């Protein structure tokens, strides 16, 4: 549950990604694939090699949904309705994976926003990523 310090903090960090959110969506995917190889069973159709176009474009898709969750921090459920549906009924990623990719988004952020990735910004993003994960998997059954 995001408190007002939480949303403020996510609004801030996120603001600084700006223009690189896609660059970062893609390396978050690239850290995951390599640190958690099992995550790869969902992209058997993608080239997963370094600097693949598929991954890169996928990086942006995802980045943009994150962005769109930042903006609608108070109405995720509605901001993300279409997407939970997509994940619950078509993709069916096992819920446990949401946490492996959240964690790679954290690392990536940490590594690119050293001044702002403070303990409380860290704690905030974490709770963030956790509630978008909860919203994606909310219609699984």
């Amino acid at each position: 549950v995001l408190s007002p310090a939480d949303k403020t903090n996510v609004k801030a960090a996120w603001g600084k990604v700006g223009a690189h959110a896609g660059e970062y969506g893609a390396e978050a995917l690239e850290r995951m694939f390599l640190s958690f190889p099992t995550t790869k069973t969902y992209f058997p159709h993608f080239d997963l090699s370094h600097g693949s176009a598929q991954v890169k474009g996928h990086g942006k898709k995802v980045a943009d949904a994150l962005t769109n969750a930042v903006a609608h921090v108070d109405d995720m459920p509605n901001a993300l309705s279409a997407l939970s549906d997509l994940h619950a009924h078509k993709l069916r990623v096992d819920p446990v994976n949401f946490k492996l990719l959240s964690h790679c988004l954290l690392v990536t952020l940490a590594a690119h926003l050293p001044a702002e990735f403070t303990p409380a910004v860290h704690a905030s993003l974490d709770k963030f990523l956790a509630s978008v994960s909860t919203v994606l998997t909310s219609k699984y059954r």
Partner: protein
């Protein structure tokens, strides 16, 4: 896995009484019902829209018997599950693309079917040994993923 001999005896004496044809059908089908996303792999098995369409689907019933017969054969190799399951590990990774976590879902669903069937006979200590066996299989199956 590291089972006591009083644990590998309990596993083994019970297992002895299971009807694998029908317990594989019941554990695979309860999986597709309680963890519906698991159906992602079985589109070609037909109608799985309802509990009775799944549990009575003859393809579900016939796949469940393949799974447990396999499961049954590693029970003879408790001391070598990795070796036992390595070509099925590669099969599931390399070709079917099954997230290993599916494997931990089914061991738990297997554990509730045994309880369901043996009743009072699946005691606290018999469950704790099966919990071990199923984690051994889950892992042995997940070994060769890459």
């Amino acid at each position: 896995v590291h089972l006591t001999p009083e644990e590998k005896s309990a596993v083994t004496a019970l297992w002895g009484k299971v009807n694998v044809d029908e317990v594989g059908g019941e554990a695979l089908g309860r999986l597709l019902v309680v963890y519906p996303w698991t159906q992602r792999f079985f589109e070609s098995f037909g109608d799985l829209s309802t509990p009775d369409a799944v549990m009575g689907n003859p393809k579900v019933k016939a796949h469940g018997k393949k799974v447990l017969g396999a499961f049954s054969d590693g029970l003879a190799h408790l001391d070598n599950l990795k070796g036992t399951f390595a070509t099925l590990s590669e099969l599931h990774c390399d070709k079917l693309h099954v997230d290993p976590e599916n494997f931990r879902l089914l061991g738990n669903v297997l554990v509730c079917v045994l309880a369901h069937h043996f009743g009072k006979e699946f005691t606290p200590p018999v469950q704790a040994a099966y919990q071990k066996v199923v984690a051994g299989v889950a892992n042995a199956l997940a070994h060769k993923y890459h």
